[PDB]
Amino acid sequence: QSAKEAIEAALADFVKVYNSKDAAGVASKYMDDAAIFPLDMAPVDGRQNIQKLWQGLMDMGVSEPKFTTLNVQKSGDFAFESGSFSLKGPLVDIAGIYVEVWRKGQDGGWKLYRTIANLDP
Numbered sequence: 680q681s682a683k684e685a686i687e688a689a690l691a692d693f694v695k696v697y698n699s700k701d702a703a704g705v706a707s708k709y710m711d712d713a714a715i716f717p718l719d720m721a722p723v724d725g726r727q728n729i730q731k732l733w734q735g736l737m738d739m740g741v742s743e744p745k746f747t748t749l750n751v752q753k754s755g756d757f758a759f760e761s762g763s764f765s766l767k768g769p770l771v772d773i774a775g776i777y778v779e780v781w782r783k784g785q786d787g788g789w790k791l792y793r794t795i796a797n798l799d800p
């Protein structure tokens with residue numbers, strides 16, 4: 680298993696947990712001091728607030744998440760990722776681009792540390 684495949688597997692699980700409507704499970708995939716920065720929108724800091732974000736999307740009926748990993752570079756205990764995303768809202772397409780950093784755990788699992796994303800118009 681390569682680094683890209685490892686990240687792709689991590690995101691595949693992310694998708695499954697989201698689709699099970701388990702916002703806490705989604706939030707566990709982040710470091711506690713992780714942060715999401717949606718450009719031209721309010722930053723989201725810490726796992727607790729990140730859980731609220733994903734719970735909010737669930738509550739709004741947002742579905743069918745897809746996260747396409749384009750490029751991955753492993754650097755020390757970090758993995759640097761470029762990708763795209765697409766979701767569906769009540770059906771409305773919600774899509775865009777992101778870059779993000781994962782941190783490898785002692786257990787060998789990857790967790791999200793930093794995400795920067797932008798929504799297409």
Ligand SMILES: C=C1CC[C@H](O)C/C1=C/C=C1\CCC[C@]2(C)[C@@H]([C@H](C)CCCC(C)(C)O)CC[C@@H]12
Pocket residue numbers: 693715717720736739741746764766768773777779794796
């Ligand atoms: C349009 C909606 C639905 C309606 C709401 O009012 C505003 C809004 C939020 C969507 C968000 C903003 C935060 C950043 C999000 C959550 C993106 C993620 C950060 C994308 C990266 C996902 C991952 C796991 C690869 O790292 C996807 C949708 C984006």
